[PDB]
Amino acid sequence: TKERQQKAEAELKELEQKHTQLCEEKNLLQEKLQAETELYAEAEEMRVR
Amino acid sequence: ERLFRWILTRVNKALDKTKRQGASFLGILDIAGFEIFEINSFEQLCINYTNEKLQQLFNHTMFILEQEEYQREGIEWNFIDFGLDLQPCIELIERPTNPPGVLALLDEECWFPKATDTSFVEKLIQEQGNHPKFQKSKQLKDKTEFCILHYAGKVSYNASAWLTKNMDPLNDNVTSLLNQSSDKFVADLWKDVDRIVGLFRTVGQLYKEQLTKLMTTLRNTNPNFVRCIIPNHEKRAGKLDAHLVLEQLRCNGVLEGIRICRQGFPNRI
Amino acid sequence: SNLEKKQKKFDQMLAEEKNISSKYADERDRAEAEAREKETKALSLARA
Amino acid sequence: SNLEKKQKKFDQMLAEEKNISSKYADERDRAEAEAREKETKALSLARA
Amino acid sequence: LAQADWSAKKLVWVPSEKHGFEAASIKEEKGDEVTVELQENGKKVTLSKDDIQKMNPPKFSKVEDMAELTCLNEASVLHNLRERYFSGLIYTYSGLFCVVVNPYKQLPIYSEKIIDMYKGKKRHEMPPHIYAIADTAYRSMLQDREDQSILCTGESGAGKTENTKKVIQYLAVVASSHKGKQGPSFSYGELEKQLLQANPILEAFGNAKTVKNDNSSRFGKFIRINFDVTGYIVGANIETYLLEKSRAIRQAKDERTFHIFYYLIAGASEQMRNDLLLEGFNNYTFLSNGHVPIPAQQDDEMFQETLEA
Amino acid sequence: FSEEQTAEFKEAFQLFDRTGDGKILYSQCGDVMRALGQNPTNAEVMKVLGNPKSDEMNLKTLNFEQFLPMMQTIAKNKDQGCFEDYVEGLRVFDKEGNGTVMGAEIRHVLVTLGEKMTEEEVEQLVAGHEDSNGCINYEELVRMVLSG
Amino acid sequence: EEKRRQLLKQLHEHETELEDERKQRALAAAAKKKLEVDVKDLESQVDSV
Amino acid sequence: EEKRRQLLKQLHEHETELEDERKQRALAAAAKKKLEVDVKDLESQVDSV
């Protein structure tokens, strides 16, 4: 039971960290990427103009 | 302002997950009151314009909506106009495509590479000049001041530092430094240094846009009004002016409001 | 005022007969209650 | 309208004065009969 | 006999300045000129015809429902409003909406028995109260299955803003659910007390003394109260707008700025006063117009109030 | 009536005695009567309770002797409101005839109409049958109340 | 009741997920942006003509 | 308990399907209505300038 807890509780901290730097930081980077895409679309529009 | 915004965010954090989206929410609006000061700066004009805008909203929803719903349902009803509208008194502030309103004029004046409050007053008096709700300065047009009529009376305004009070430039270096200050709370207070000008979009456009957003959200809701009238500027109990409350309930258009239900049909089914 | 008056008049027009029938039914119910009381008192005397 | 209301006032007053006694007397008689029946039945069942 | 007395159209209102509109009798009429005489004093002066303000039958005095007046005269409505005010009846119904005139005195019209005797009943079933219009809003929002809204206007706020927090106090208890757990007396919940304190919490800021008013919303505010399908509070939201930056940094002529500063002056702990390196009045360039004694209020009291809130 | 069910009557009567002798408060004995299927309105209850006042109802109890004529008078009703009454009235009470009836309106018009009841009374009445639509099937609850 | 509470917690997690940017969260915002951009593009095409 | 577990599983499946459809619709309305209309408006501003 104890080694399975450590197989789960030390897995739960893995879930927490991978969610804060792989799912939450993922969303932050997603916002950054959307901003970059929109600003580059504006840049290319200004380019052709 | 950043402190106030953080306080507002924290109090909105009363509940978010527990704030499961309901279906019959309730809206409550309490606005700044119409004020007449010896010096009414730009912000005074903003709040008084908001007052006028919501008063026009009430007048519309109170007379127009009803009179047009009558004919729209084919009921026998002559359109009984009551001569109550602030449509020009509101158009004169914002209308961009025609001769620009006060907001658009101020935007193109502050975005000018080099201008002055007096230059802005000149651009205004040459732009509208003859608008009924507008009246140029009392022989002191060079004094960068000007008065406007409103649904509560005529109030003056001094354009002193109006372009600065709109643009609001800040030292970018100190903002960046404070963004990286030791304390974490001040970092939270200064973790959104994105468009703070120090050399894009100023406060007029944001304010009018979000106000229009509020009004759009509100008009999609069956409203309900209650109005409050001051006894007197005495700030004292007991006494109560006569002509004051007279003109107050007059400009509020309450008698014709009563006349509506006295003559109209305020029920729908 | 005229609408209120006409409503009151049209109501009373039928309310006359309504109250007549109501008084009739009330008298009938009172007589029935009196008869039931008499029967209950007879049963009470028998039981006593 | 004032004339019609003045007429309807006396009309409804007479109608109410008529219907009141026609109901109040019956109501009192029915209430007395009900009270007597209740008391008699209670005493009868206590004795029983 | 007074009915037949003022039944003649010669006992009617009249414009003036001593009270704006008074009541005057009339002897006779010349063409379109009415022989106006002041029944109050004796001032007899003929006036034009356009001054037709019928003095409504005094049997309808102090009526709270202006939507039933036989004669909708400007003088008549000012009259009725004045007497309802002097009779301590601030809230007054009128057609579709209501009118309130804050008398700057705390009228004891806030009690749980008032809540109950005003909850549930319809509009005209009870005397005009802000609790009643709130309850009507509640019944409407639960009836239509769609949202509702209420708004307040005015010029200064000390009465044009107090009504909003009064409605808040009402709604915090009229529709609070029970998950176990005079005036607002009820087994409150967490969110109830928190939303009640939400008003003074933020109003510690955005509240300053003007030359006209001493305390009110120095900005625009909008409150959103979500609800469930069984009519219960499920979420609160606040929306605030531009602040008085001028007063915040440079106070106006003899005007008290955001009360939070004066509260901090003599509300904090001398320990924390020195720990924040502070000082009293007459020690700040930003203290234009210096310090003012706020009428009938103290700083430390509301300071501790806001802290606990 | 008969001693046939008077045994159950006696055990129920003494079951809810706060003194354990046969004296049960007027409110309590009316509640027992209602629990015995015979559930009339408190109006006729007071009518056959000698027309007392609330103070007398909360201070004066009743013996089992007078309890027999009391349920006798209750049995003189011989009928109550019918099932078709309730179903049709609730059906016509809804706003759109959608097989159900909204909940909050029912709670309000129940605690604030005719006979007054507390909010938790109708709450635990409607409890369990709630739905996200707020519109409860009046039929199932009314037949449960009638049969139960 | 405990199983119902667990199901309610799962439903609340799903509602918070769909309440960030999914339907009934930002689909209305996307529809509003599309409706505001369509008329703008139409006016711009009219100006170009 | 089995029936409540089945109901919770059905709710989870319905929520997953709704979230998938919501993400698809959001991606469509974002990559289609925003950037294309922006490019069209920029090209029309060019044609007007």
PDB file of C-alpha atoms in Angstrom, chain C residues 6-27:
ATOM      1  CA  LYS C   6     -70.151  49.876 -15.417  1.00  0.00           C
ATOM      2  CA  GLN C   7     -68.173  46.940 -14.026  1.00  0.00           C
ATOM      3  CA  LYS C   8     -69.816  47.365 -10.621  1.00  0.00           C
ATOM      4  CA  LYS C   9     -73.276  47.598 -12.197  1.00  0.00           C
ATOM      5  CA  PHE C  10     -72.829  44.549 -14.432  1.00  0.00           C
ATOM      6  CA  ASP C  11     -71.512  42.641 -11.419  1.00  0.00           C
ATOM      7  CA  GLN C  12     -74.426  43.583  -9.151  1.00  0.00           C
ATOM      8  CA  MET C  13     -76.927  42.712 -11.902  1.00  0.00           C
ATOM      9  CA  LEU C  14     -76.142  39.012 -11.466  1.00  0.00           C
ATOM     10  CA  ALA C  15     -74.976  39.367  -7.854  1.00  0.00           C
ATOM     11  CA  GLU C  16     -78.600  40.004  -6.882  1.00  0.00           C
ATOM     12  CA  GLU C  17     -79.649  36.483  -7.885  1.00  0.00           C
ATOM     13  CA  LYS C  18     -76.295  35.150  -6.666  1.00  0.00           C
ATOM     14  CA  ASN C  19     -76.986  36.458  -3.157  1.00  0.00           C
ATOM     15  CA  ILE C  20     -80.579  35.208  -3.332  1.00  0.00           C
ATOM     16  CA  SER C  21     -79.334  31.689  -4.073  1.00  0.00           C
ATOM     17  CA  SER C  22     -76.633  32.063  -1.415  1.00  0.00           C
ATOM     18  CA  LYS C  23     -79.174  32.975   1.266  1.00  0.00           C
ATOM     19  CA  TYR C  24     -81.345  30.058   0.137  1.00  0.00           C
ATOM     20  CA  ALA C  25     -78.452  27.594   0.386  1.00  0.00           C
ATOM     21  CA  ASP C  26     -77.410  29.040   3.750  1.00  0.00           C
ATOM     22  CA  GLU C  27     -80.924  28.567   5.127  1.00  0.00           C
TER      23      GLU C  27
END
